[PDB]
Structures are given as C-alpha cells and as structure tokens.
Amino acid sequence: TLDEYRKHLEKDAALERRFQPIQVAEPSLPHTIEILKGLRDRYEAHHRVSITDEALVQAATLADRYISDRFLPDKAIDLIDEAGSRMRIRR
Amino acid sequence: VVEGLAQAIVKGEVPETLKDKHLYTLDLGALVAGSRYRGDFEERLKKVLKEIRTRGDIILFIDALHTLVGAGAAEGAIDAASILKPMLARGELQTIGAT
Amino acid sequence: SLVLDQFGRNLTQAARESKLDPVIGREKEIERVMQVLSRRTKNNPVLIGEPGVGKTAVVEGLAQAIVKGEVPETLKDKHLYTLDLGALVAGSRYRGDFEERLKKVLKEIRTRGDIILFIDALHTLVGAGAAEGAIDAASILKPMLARGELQTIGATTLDEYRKHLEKDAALERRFQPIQVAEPSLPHTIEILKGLRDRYEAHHRVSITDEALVQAATLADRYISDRFLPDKAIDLIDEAGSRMRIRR
Amino acid sequence: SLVLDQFGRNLTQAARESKLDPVIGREKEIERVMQVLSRRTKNNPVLIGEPGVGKTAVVEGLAQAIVKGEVPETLKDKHLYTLDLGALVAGSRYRGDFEERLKKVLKEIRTRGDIILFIDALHTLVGAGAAEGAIDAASILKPMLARGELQTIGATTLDEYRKHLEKDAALERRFQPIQVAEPSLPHTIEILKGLRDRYEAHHRVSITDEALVQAATLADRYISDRFLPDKAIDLIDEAGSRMRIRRVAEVDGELIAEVLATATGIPVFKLTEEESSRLLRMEDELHKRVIGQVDAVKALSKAIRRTRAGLKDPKRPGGSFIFAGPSGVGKTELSKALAEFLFGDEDALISLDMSEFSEKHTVSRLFGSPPGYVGYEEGGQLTEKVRRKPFSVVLFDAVEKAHPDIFNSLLQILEDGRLTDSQGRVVDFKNTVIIMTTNLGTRDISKGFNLGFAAQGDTKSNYERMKNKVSDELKQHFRPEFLNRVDDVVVFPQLSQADILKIVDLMIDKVDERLKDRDMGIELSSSAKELLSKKGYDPVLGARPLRRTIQREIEDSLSEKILFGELRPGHIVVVDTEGEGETKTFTFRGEE
Amino acid sequence: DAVKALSKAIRRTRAGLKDPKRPGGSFIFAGPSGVGKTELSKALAEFLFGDEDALISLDMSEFSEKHTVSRLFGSPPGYVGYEEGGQLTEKVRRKPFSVVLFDAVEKAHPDIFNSLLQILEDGRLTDSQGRVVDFKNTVIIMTTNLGTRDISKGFNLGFAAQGDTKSNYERMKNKVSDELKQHFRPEFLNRVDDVVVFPQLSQADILKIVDLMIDKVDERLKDRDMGIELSSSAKELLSKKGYDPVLGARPLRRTIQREIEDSLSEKILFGELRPGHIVVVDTEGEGETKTFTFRGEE
C-alpha cells in the first residue's frame, strides 16, 4: 500500500538502491464494466443465476457514486455476489 | 563517496597511516539474523569488535547510522549506538556514517 | 571486575599505562574533589561546568594522582571506574530487567569495597528506567548516597543542573556542587604548551610557540559559541591534519 | 528470617550494634508514632516533612528505644524491618513473580507476628509491579492495612506526598499523617553536641562548643536553600574534611566561618589587622579612581564599615543609596569603583538599565511569568542572578527613564530584604547593596538669581539650590513610602576646574597603560596637561568632552604616526605645547 | 484601637462564639507610613505561634497585572505548571490555623481581590485541580496607606472663617473611608469585619521606641560579647533629633544608625572596643550643640 510504502519502505536505505516502484491507479468506470463482464461467467456459474448488462452498469454507477469507504474494482463484485446470494437463498 | 575513498586507498593515493589500512562496511542484517534475543546480539558484535581490535587496521563504514542512534522511541527498536558508545570514547576504531 | 568492565571503563589502570593526557593548572579543583570525597556523609562531588572546560580533565588528573602523587588516606589505592547509564538501561523490555543489572553492579561494588564511581553526563539519572511500574535508579541510589555508603562523582552543565537537578530537592541534597571556570588566556597557553608534545608525536610535524599563541587568541576572539580550552586544541588538530594531508 | 532478610534490613539488629546515630529531642514525634501504632485499626503512621529534617532519624530513634527497652506497652522486643522495594522488583520478568515474593513476605510476617515494616519513600508504593496496570503492591497491601494487620511506618516529603501519594485516595486513607517540623536553634545545637562524638571519631579531630554554636547560627542565618539540621552538620563535616586533608588538630569557629564564606561568597570570616586597616582607609582607595564626590564616598565607606563590623540590620540589605546628580559626574564610575573594591573586578556588578523598563508590564523581567504562561519555567532574571551571588551590588541606572510603578517591587527589597519569584521561591536581598542613579532636579544648573525684581539678591551656593531642587523633585516623583525606606540620598556636586587636571592625569595614565602593550609609552609636560584641562572644561556636560578631546587630539596623531611607521616599539613619545592663546597646539617627539 | 480589635477577635475565637462558616477575623489596617501596620501583624504572629516567621505574608506589589492571579490558584488543566497547584492554597492547607497578610493592597490590580470574596464570606478557596481548601480558622489582615497623602496639609482651597476643629485623626479617617469606597467595590467592603485607622506617633511614642531600638542594637553587640548602655539624656537627645510626624519611626532608625552605629563601627575596627567590654553613651554640651560621647568600660 502507498501509505505503508512511504512510511516504512522509504526509511530502509539499504534496499532503496535495489527496489523500483510501479504505481497502479484506480480503474475507470469502463474498466470496471469490462472486469464485471469478465467475471460474469464465473459468478453466474457459482450462484446458478443470470445477470444482465444493465445490472452491471447500474451496480458500477451505484458503487462509484453512493459508496466511499470501499473502492470500485472490488465493491461492484461484492454487490453482484451479494445479489446472487440473495437470489440463491430465496429458492 | 565511500567507495571513491575505498578506491583511492586501493590505488594508494591516500596519506600515510592509512595507505595499508583495510576498509570494511557493516550491515545490521547479518548480525540481527539468526538471533533469538539481545543476548545473541552482544556476542556477535563483541566478537567482531575484538577481531578488528586484534587486526587493528580496519575502518568501519556503517551506513544508516541514523537508525543506530535514533532507535529508542518505540517498542522493538534496537538501539546499538549506546552499545557503540564506549569504544568510540576510547577511539580504537574509525567509523564513517551517512545521514 | 568484569561486570564493571562490561558496563564501564577503568581510569586508574589506563593512567598506569600512560593513556591519559596530562592536566595542567587544576590543583584547586582536584583538592576540592578530595575535600568533598572525604566527608562522612553526602561525599558525592558534582562538577558543574559549561561544555568545553576540563570537567573530565580534572577527573583524569585525580585518577593520575591516585596512581601516583599526593593522596590522603581513605582515598589511596582506590579504583576509579566510569559507568555509563545509557548502556545500563538498554536492552530492558520486561518487568524488573533494568533493576537486576543495577543491583548486580552495586553488589559487585560493595563486594570489592575500594571503587569510586564516575557517572559521566549526569542529570540523566532522574529518568533512568522511569517506567509506569519500574522504579527509577534515583530511588534505588538515594539511601546509599544519603548515608555515604556509595562514593560517586558526577559531571553536568549549569543549565542541565538547574533545570533537572535543582528541581528534585531530594537528589540535589545528596550532591555537593563544584564549579569549574573557563581557563584564562595564560592558562590555555600553558595547557597548549603541555599538550603540544602529544600532538607532535601523533602528527609528524612541529608546532611553534607563536602558533599556539595565535591559535589561543584567535579562537578566543572569533569563536563565541564554543569555549576556549577546546576550540584552540581543535584548531591545532585541524592545522596538523591539513599539514599531514598536504604532504 | 531468610526470606525476610533477602528483601529487607533489620534495623533493631543494627541498633543493637550501635550502627545508628543518636537521636536527640524527638520525644514528641516518637511518642505520637507509638501512640498511633497501638490503634486497633489503621495503625499505620506516616511522617511527612521537608527534606533535611529528621524523618528517618525518628524511625531510627524508635528502633533504638525498642532495643533499649524504654518502649512500654505492646511494643516489646519487636523487630523493625526496613523493606527494600528494589529487591522485590529485581528480576521477576515472568507473570506472578513479584506477587509471589510479596505474598511470601507477607505470610512470613503474619506467621512470626512481631514484625513492624518500615517503607522509606512511601510514594514509590503506588506503582511497584504494574507491568500493565492492575495488581500492584498497593492493591495487595490495601486489605491487611485497612483491617488493622501489618503495622507499617512510612516516610515522605510534602511535595512527594501531594504529587504521588494523593493520586491513590484508597491507599492514602489507610495512613495517619504526622508532621515533623524543622528544629529550632537550641535543638540544632543539642543535635550537634550529640553528633560531635561520632564526627570527631570519624574525622580524627576535636571540635569546640563555640565551633558548633557558630556553625548552627551561620547555617541558620546565611545559607537559605535547605533546612536547619542538615545544613548545620554540613559545615562541621566540610571543616573536618578540610582539616583532615591538611595532614590532634583543632576545629574552631574561625574555620567554620571561613568554610561558609568560601562556600557562599559572603565575607563572614574573622577580621584581620591588614583588612581592618584597609577598611579604615577605604575612602582613599575609592579616591584612587574617583576625584571629588566626598559625601558619596564617605556614605559608601560608612555602609561597608557597618556591614563588616557586625552592626548591620540582619533583616535588611547592607545599604540603599540614591545617587542624584548631573551628567558625567562619576555616579556609574563610583559604582564600578565600589564593585572593583569589593570583588577585585568591576565586571562583577549587576547592572540593570531602566531605559528599557518603560512599559509597566516589563516588571515581569524582575521575577518571571505567572504559572500557565510562556517563560514560566525560566523563573526571574534579577532573582536568578542574585540567588547565585548572595553578596553583590545591584545598580538601577537612570531610574527616571522607567515607569514609576516598576519600583513598587523594591518595597519588599529595601524593607524586608526579600523577593519572591513567580515559582514561589524566596530570594533574600539581605547581603546586597542597592544603588539607584538619577538626574532629577539637575537640569537647570544656571541662573544664580530669581526671576523678577529682587532687592537683596539672596545669594546662595549652587550646591544648596541643587540639593533643595533634587529633594523636591524626588518628593514629587516617588511615593512617600518608597522614599521612607532609602537609607541615603546623596547629591553629586558639579565638577570643578581643579578636578579636571586630575581626571586628565588618570585618563592619560589609562592611555599609557593601553599603549604599553605594544612596547610604547607617552609622557606629558605640565603645559600639555593644563592646555587639555582648559580646552575641555565644559561644566555642563561633565567629563565626557574631556574624553572626546583626548580621543581626537592625542589618539588620532599617535595612530597616524604608527600607521606611517614614524615610531617603532621601544619609543617613548613626549608631548609638549607651542604657541600662545589660540595658537597653542601639541607637539610630539620621539625618544627611546 | 487596633490592639483592642485583634484581642477581641482572638478572644471571640477562643471563647467559642466564632461563626463556623467564616474566618476568625478580617481586618483592613489603613494608615500612614512607618506607624506599625506590619509590626502589629508580626507581633500577633509571634504571640500566637512562636515568632514572626510563622506568618504567611504576600507582597501585593508583585500582583500588578491581573493575569498573575493564577499564583493563588494554579494553572488550569492542560497548561504548564498545572500539577504544581496553587501557592497560597497549599500553604493554607498545610497549616489551617495561621495569619494571612496582604501587604500594600492598593498596589495590586483591583481584580485579584475579587478572589477574596469567597474567602471572606464562605471561608473557602478552590484551586485549579478542583480541591477545596478552607480558610475558616485563619485571620486575614490587609495593610494599606490609602487616603494618607494629605496628612501634611494645612488648609483647603478657598476662603474660610475660623478653622477645622477636628484633629488630624478625624480628617484622615474620613479621607481613608472615602478612598476605600472609591477604590474597592461595595461587595468587597461589605465582607470586611473591621477597618482600623492608624494615627500618627507622638513624641512619647518615639521616646519609648528608642528603648526597643537600643535593645536590638544591644542584642547585635552582645552577639560579639559586648553591650551598650545609654543615659536618660542620650535617649532624650536621640528622641529629639529623630522625630518627623509624617514619616513615622523610620527617621528615628536612620538617626540612631547615623549617630551610634557609625561611631561604634569606627571604634571596633580601630580596636578601642573589644570583646569583654561595654560602651556607655552620654551627652556633652548644651542647647543645639549637644553631642554624644562614648566611653569604654569592662
């Protein structure tokens, strides 16, 4: 994590000449849609349910807009898995 | 700069009383590793110190001496500067630091 | 005596080996040290002096006098041992770790019975091992210091003494202050004259008297944040090092 | 007793071997301790007192009384054990070790049934084994202490009692405080008489009764940072050590006075013939540097002679003077001369400039900031300086340039000889000399007549008019209560023409002394001195135009000659004069 | 009058008729300089406990700024010096029965005494740590010289027939009352038990004080095994020489020192007066040329 890296890995002067940093940025909303489409097959197979693209895009938008504590590349997956669990438990 | 000084010593472009005096660098990783508590810490440092005292012509470069000095502000920190206090008072070894 | 050697240094033995620089013109302070050390109670001298003056120098001179020279009774053939409080408190993480080492050191000192302790850089004793449950070194040492059982010599600067030791009226009672004044120009001149030989032996050069006079005067004039008996010696050392590196 | 001896010391056994110093005059405290120890419940006395008084001596005397069998009622052949908390905490790095040791000690005490515990520095009992904070020594000891078992005696200072022991109200509840007061002078003399035998035995010397009386009186009067029983013994011990290192010998009051004088700096040592002769001619010594001003020199000499003859008021400073006079007359010079006479160097004077004390809040520089404010830790500037040097000269220069309300703080200095800084400490000004310099009423030194038509002309000496005007101005400026405490108010007469020649001689001597460092010298003829005196009379501005004239008439020419290389080391420049009237001018000539 | 007031307060306290919710007594000693305002407090303390050293004395010249009041309470929580507590509160708590003296009350800021209200009415004071220290067994004395600036005044501005038949005491009492009402709030003056005005000293008072001052000088001399004895003429001359109705008995002290101690010091330094000897002082001459003569004696 960035905060841990700057707080602890920066002071290790011995390894400063041996490590190189590579930054990873948050995924954009189209990237989130792509990841959701990629995971559609596995999650539908696990939950024994069917999900549509409109659900994907609305879940991504709701996660981006109305959720702040968690972050996009995981919370949309969490929401769709949660919905799949809800559909599984009612039958 | 440290290895520049070492190279200048190696080719001999260095004043007397230092033209045949070896230079070594010390890292805490080797001495800390393989130890359970501070009882093993003192044994290794005292052994290497008596070894260099018998040798008598070793310059010790301790990079990140800032960790050595300021290591008493939290639990689990190893503050060896006081451990490295007495002999430096006698000055039987030469040390080089960077901070 | 290996216990004290682990946590400190022996001064009389080193002085017997001529490993200590000679001291010049400090007879009054060393005599006052003997005066305080011979008291029946509270015989613990403390040297209050600003950095640079010979606070350690007078202790080294006293050690040399004990090795050879005029020394009264009840103080002859004693062993002067310097103890470091910083190394004593290091490595203590559990309950009672710090107290055990200090108790062992005091037991060794009592068993030997002929040791005078020197706690360099005093005023750190007030907060030595002051944990929430552990008792500090001051509380342990107070009964022996007040009854004269333990003989110790401390050194500190005036500001440290006033802002840390004067506030603690209990610990301040058990120490007798001794003032060390900054040497005058002739005193520094003769000190440099005495110390010239060791530096000439160390750096293979020669130092003239006018060089010493100029060093003393210029260090006294152009430097104010340091003090005379040290900056002149630093100037001489720097000149010797520069002459060595040039050749 | 093996486990009990492993963590404590038997005081009764030591008292049986005469290893404890005798205790004198503590019958009431020991009786109260015994009375408290006999209670059914909460029989745990604690002695709270200032550091130095015999708090531990009371317990030692109780142990000696138990050994001697003087103690009646239940306390018969009881064993008093001093507990060592350091041994209990030593080691015990694992859970349940310190608690186990304390439980074992308590079980041993309960089984034997005739053990009385003594815990020196009871304030350390609050935190003993609180590795995380829970079961410590106090929590274990609370029930037995409350129910009446485990009789215990504690000792603590007032500051430690308030700061630490009162943070645990449950533990403080189970103790009955007892006040140990500082002994008076006769009690201190009795204590010194009691301990004389032991101190003579240790120091291998002999001590007279006069030595003990002098030590007690001088320690009570002059040394004010500690308390009576200890600081009196300190003088005797220091004198014994000083006599021992010099090698039966003898210790008298003179040695004690010398020891105190060298410890504190106050000259209380015995008078000598040479010193008495020097004091009797102090006016000449002061006149070796200041010309004229006979009244002020006489007043200063009288004050110093009163101080050194043992006739000064022991509750007021040595002297208080108001030097009122015109500019450049010798007030600051006289103060510097007095400082040089008293201490050997004129830079030992404590000089305070009232030119910068214009704001009324600047009085905070005298004694420091109140609690809770910035700079509170650095308590006082004047008080700190006076505390380090009890015997010194305090000078308030140009008091008319400061706010009038600043001097109210001197009301307790001139009359009571004390000043309290904001931290609560009291610094005594009873051994200092206070001088305040001013130029009030010395403005219009002219007009030897009165405005308007007059018939007789009512001639009067300028000195009398100056004196009356200064008195009126002082009455107008300061409050009556402030002026009522000043010992002497002296007016400096204006400098005369004759004194200018002597001042010129002194200035030329100073110039020659400065010049002799470079192997030089200067000589003058009477004509040159007369010309210098005539050229710079200026009766209004004092002797400052004289320095300016000497600087820009002799220093510049010598400097130019040195720069040109006209003269070399080993030369003695002789200066004469030439011309007449306005043509009079100096001429320089080399010599060897 | 002041001695009667103090004795009445002490007797009422000891007889058991004291109000158990207020201090033993509260007095405002107002009067000119050098009349015995502080001397009476020291004498009361010496009579009470054992000496004048048991007095709790505050010099109000240091409380010039209104933010110094913390020296009575201590710093509030979260500020430097909070753990030290108050300075007056601690002293009173460690000695519940004592005499508290406020010297030169008019030279402090007129807000510090706002903190005395609860002291003078409820007999309590709270420090910054919340602890209550009671004052119900103390005696409060406040000394001042307000309204005494016009003692050396002959008449008022304007024409007037005959003159003021009232002595200096009545005029000074009225002036003190007016100045006290002007300087302090009514609620503060409503809590003070007694206000005592000190009249000036007469010639007989100076003659009597001469004996006490000579006794003090004799004690100082006896400290070196000596002594001094004066004749009646010497005492009368000393009383006549030093006497000013405005400045009290301090000019008498200055006159005594100048006319006795300087000569004694000169004689001791020279060697005429030595231990084991006493000095006898007599008078010579007549009229305004009368002077002192010192004679040694075993």
Ligand SMILES: Nc1ncnc2c1ncn2[C@@H]1O[C@H](COP(=O)(O)OP(=O)(O)OP(=O)(O)O)[C@@H](O)[C@H]1O
């Ligand atoms: N009576 C004197 N004897 C010797 N030197 C004197 C005398 N009066 C003045 N001087 C010389 O004049 C110099 C200036 O006088 P000084 O500093 O004493 O003045 P002051 O009385 O303090 O006046 P000011 O009110 O201006 O401060 C002194 O340093 C000294 O060299």
Ligand SMILES: Nc1ncnc2c1ncn2[C@@H]1O[C@H](COP(=O)(O)OP(=O)(O)OP(=O)(O)O)[C@@H](O)[C@H]1O
């Ligand atoms: N009535 C008196 N009886 C005896 N001595 C007195 C009397 N009045 C004054 N003195 C002497 O004069 C000295 C100074 O008087 P004191 O300190 O009592 O004055 P004060 O009334 O408090 O005035 P100030 O307003 O100046 O503080 C006393 O120490 C004492 O020696």
Ligand SMILES: Nc1ncnc2c1ncn2[C@@H]1O[C@H](COP(=O)(O)OP(=O)(O)O)[C@@H](O)[C@H]1O
């Ligand atoms: N009286 C003296 N005679 C000779 N050398 C002295 C004397 N006093 C001080 N020195 C020299 O000054 C140097 C610095 O003194 P130091 O021991 O550092 O004093 P401190 O520890 O109080 O600063 C020492 O190396 C010592 O050789």
Ligand SMILES: Nc1ncnc2c1ncn2[C@@H]1O[C@H](COP(=O)(O)OP(=O)(O)O)[C@@H](O)[C@H]1O
């Ligand atoms: N009543 C007394 N009789 C004899 N000596 C006393 C008495 N009171 C105090 N002393 C001496 O005072 C010295 C210091 O007292 P101390 O026991 O240190 O008191 P505290 O422990 O309270 O500081 C002791 O050496 C003791 O000899």
Ligand SMILES: [Mg+2]
């Ligand atoms: Mg001046």
Ligand SMILES: [Mg+2]
């Ligand atoms: Mg008064």
